[PDB]
Design a protein around this nucleic acid. Structure first.
Ligand SMILES: [Zn+2]
Ligand SMILES: [Zn+2]
Length: 454
RNA sequence: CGCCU
């Protein structure tokens, strides 16, 4: 039930067929990249990086292998960016380095983030900003964009129409029914699409092993308020620099309890800068201040929103825990790790927590408080979703093998036929011919290591 | 289940 060990190169793509090829995100979560082919032309959905398990000198980032598209960069009609996370957009500078006039298609915030990253590489891309509801033709690919709710604002699924049929790519999504910005995952859109006919659905598998439903983000507010209410000294909150809604809730609590907020960390400052700038983050006047002024403030009036929720040794939280930061942890400080614990980072995270605890901090985290909810649909949501989309072929994407198999089983339960559910690996080539999806070959899709110069 | 600088 896996791809055949020796799959040759794929045959010619039949006239009228579509060819889908995950170059990343399958078997190992990250460096997500999917290549769509129709009539010799290529559409790329996401191009991200993957963060290495260790691996110290000479290995900063891991990219998708561009081998199967490098000899045909001229065929690429565009790169669609479903949302602004690094394992979806982090690879773009290394792809554009090889052909800089490939157009980036994406939401406003998505584009602003990727443009910020590209600036550091001296690259200015051609872009096409889209919003939910926009429909646009990109070479042979007719792209309609659909709102999805998630850990970052402004994320899109995309429905791609060709004469091979309609392919829906969900990007990353969950289904919060009470999102901070009122922006729901557009089930109306999906239902309409489903009545037109969804021939191949590529769906987020990240949380498919998890039963039930993701608690709504707004529940976190309660916990934050409890923590804030009982915190007699400074509060330090760590989160991913892109989690705008999370941070929104931290400012909300800060305001409620008469505290001032300062952002610490390059990424955090940059991103909250962009989010605030474009209206995604709503900040009441007088709340946010420079970190330098925090010295002048009483402890009980101070909230630091900083960086390094995954124990990244160069980030704020870690250096604080290692007594190597301008900010010095003291007995009585409250630290909240308002984040996930990505598998593999347990050593680093726990080391940070132990350091913090050692210096006298009370540390709130997902292990002792409900201060984080997943960004991805659980088994419950996925069932809701499959019952609305009713895909005719299903490809689980974005997960380790256990995740994909889970997602596959859910699809099965909703009535997707087993022979129409295809589990792929990086480099496995799926052809949508005559409305059926079949594994037809595989291409080179190993790992590629980069130091910023590759 | 996405870094960080
Ligand atoms: Zn994401
Ligand atoms: Zn992702």
């Amino acid at each position: 039930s896996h791809p055949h060990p020796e799959l040759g190169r794929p045959p010619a793509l039949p006239k009228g067929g579509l060819r889908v090829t995950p170059l990343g995100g399958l078997g190992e979560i990250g460096r997500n990249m999917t290549v769509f082919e129709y009539g010799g032309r290529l559409l790329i959905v996401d191009c991200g990086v993957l963060f290495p398990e260790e691996e110290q000198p000479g290995i900063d980032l891991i990219l998708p292998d561009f081998t199967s598209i490098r000899d045909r960069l001229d065929d690429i009609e565009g790169i669609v960016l479903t949302h602004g996370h690094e394992d979806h957009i982090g690879g773009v500078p290394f792809l554009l380095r090889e052909k800089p006039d490939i157009p980036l298609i994406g939401s406003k915030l998505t584009l602003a983030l990727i443009e910020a990253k590209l600036q550091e590489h001296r690259i200015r891309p051609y872009t096409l900003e889209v919003a939910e509801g926009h429909r646009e033709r990109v070479g042979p690919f007719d792209c309609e964009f659909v709102a999805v709710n998630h850990s970052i604002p402004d994320a899109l699924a995309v429905a791609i129409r060709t004469p091979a049929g309609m392919v829906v790519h969900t990007g990353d999504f969950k289904m919060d029914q009470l999102p901070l910005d009122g922006r729901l995952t557009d089930l109306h859109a999906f239902a309409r699409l489903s009545e037109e006919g969804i021939d191949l659905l590529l769906a987020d598998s990240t949380n498919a092993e998890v039963p039930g439903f993701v608690p709504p983000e707004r529940d976190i507010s309660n916990v934050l308020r409890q923590v804030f209410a009982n915190a007699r000294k400074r509060i330090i909150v760590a989160s991913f620099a892109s989690h705008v809604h999370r941070i929104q809730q931290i400012l909300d609590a800060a305001h409620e309890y008469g505290r001032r907020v300062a952002f610490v960390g390059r990424s955090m400052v940059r991103n909250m800068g962009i989010a605030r700038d474009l209206g995604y983050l709503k900040v009441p006047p007088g709340l946010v201040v420079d970190v330098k002024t925090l010295d002048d403030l009483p402890d009980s009036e101070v909230v630091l929103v900083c960086t390094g929720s995954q124990g990244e040794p160069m980030a704020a939280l870690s250096r604080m825990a290692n007594r190597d930061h301008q900010i010095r942890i003291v007995n009585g400080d409250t630290v909240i790790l308002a984040s996930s614990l990505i598998p593999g980072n347990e050593n680093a995270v726990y080391r940070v927590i132990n350091g913090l605890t050692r210096w006298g901090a009370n540390v709130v985290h997902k292990g002792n408080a409900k201060v984080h909810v997943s960004g991805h649909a659980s088994a419950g949501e996925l069932l809701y979703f499959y019952n609305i989309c009713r895909p005719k072929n299903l490809m689980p994407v974005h997960g380790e093998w256990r995740h994909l198999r889970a997602n596959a089983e859910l699809g099965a339960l909703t009535g997707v036929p087993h022979d129409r559910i295809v589990i792929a690996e990086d480099g496995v080539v799926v052809d949508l011919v005559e409305g059926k999806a079949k594994i037809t070959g595989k291409v080179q899709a190993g790992y590629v290591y980069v130091d910023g110069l590759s």
